[PDB]
Amino acid sequence: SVKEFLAKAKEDFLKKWETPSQNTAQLDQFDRIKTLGTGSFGRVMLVKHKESGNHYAMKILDKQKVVKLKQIEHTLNEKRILQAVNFPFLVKLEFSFKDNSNLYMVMEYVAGGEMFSHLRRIGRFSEPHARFYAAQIVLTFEYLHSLDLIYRDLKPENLLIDQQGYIQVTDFGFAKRVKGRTWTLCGTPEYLAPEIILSKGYNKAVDWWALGVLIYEMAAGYPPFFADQPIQIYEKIVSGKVRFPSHFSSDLKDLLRNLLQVDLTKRFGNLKNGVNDIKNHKWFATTDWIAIYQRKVEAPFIPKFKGPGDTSNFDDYEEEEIRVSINEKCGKEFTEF
């Protein structure tokens, strides 16, 4: 029973939320091999942990760049939340630590690469294929939401595929523990809920909209609202008019009309039955929700992998040496990290 499950999951989370993990490794414990992806204030690298021999993904954040992009609280959020959560489709934070110059989050290496690359490469996913992924996101949002957590950055570029073909959600850069409404203008333009765009103050229903954009993009191969510049994206989103590819099933279209619903009183995930309206929708009728949580469902696609340190599922990136100053930067700001 979800209720009993979710209640012990909250008890677990709160213990760690209240007394966060800190300083559980150090930089010279790892050999840095290759950049797996880059980001706003740093990069993620494949690394090898010397004593164990295990590969990990090391997310390296330049403190100074974090401050310059005014992302201090969001970063503390990111780390405080990732060390406390635990769910089959959430990436595992194995270590965290900081030095004079950087913040480090060392995670399990998800060697499948981004959903993004396979989506663009294959073009689009079949509805069974997209439905397998969407179900994992639905369960993950149920989990997170039940902890008063809002994710706010759903998109293929943040969903990693593991060796069994299951999803691992990463980047909690915008995740927040909040009861009731919040106001930060953040996310990716194609995925923004209209209430974010119109600066109203919003709640976790923005994640259910984002799911709608995700399922569309997965099934269509392009997002429901696109343009060359975000302002035009924003007008389209605010319209709420949505057109669907001719191949979409009636079931899919119905679900998407209820997720990409500009009216919060109507948007699926936010009504009285909450997530069960989504779990019980016709599009999901063939979904075995328990078998998915227990990862018993055969995945539709299984990434090619060779050796635990293989990065062939990732784009190549320009490399830059990791500099650590002799002077501590932003020590007080990041004390709790």
Binding site: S40, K70, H74, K155, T184, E190, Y222, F226, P245
Partner: peptide, 20 residues
Amino acid sequence: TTYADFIASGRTGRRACIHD
């Protein structure tokens, strides 16, 4: 087609966020 318009667009690569 919508496909061709998307693929010819400037937003088919990895998308960057927005924030404060």
